[PDB]
Design a protein around this ligand. Structure first.
Ligand code: NA
Length: 113
């Protein structure tokens, strides 16, 4: 579609597991830095990882991001999940002014015990 960035409405993972999020963007944003942001208010969110506008994998703490500039999707991976990882997150594209952003709600469930 024509929205600058879109993701899944929600994604779910299990404590000690991993989850992946596909953030799809329109072709014109190829050479922009892409990021994964956490919390609210939306435009004060905490950046967890951000690319350098290349396809090189970036990792900070337990979060990875890899931009596929052929299919125009950047994939976020969250590993070694904790219950406190649950909450509101954002796919984003960095630009001067208001970024394109898309809200993803992250659900975490515990190890069955
Ligand atoms: Na901005």
């Amino acid at each position: 579609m024509e929205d600058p960035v879109t993701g899944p409405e929600e994604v779910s993972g299990q404590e000690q597991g991993s989850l992946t999020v596909q953030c799809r963007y329109t072709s014109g944003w190829k050479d922009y830095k892409k990021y994964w942001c956490q919390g609210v208010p939306q435009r004060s969110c905490k950046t967890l990882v951000e690319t350098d506008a290349s396809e090189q994998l970036v990792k900070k703490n337990r979060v990875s991001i890899r931009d596929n500039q052929r299919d125009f999707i950047f994939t976020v991976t969250m590993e070694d999940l904790r219950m406190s990882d649950a909450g509101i997150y954002w796919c984003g594209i960095t630009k001067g002014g208001l970024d394109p952003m898309f809200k993803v709600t992250v659900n975490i469930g515990p190890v069955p015990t």
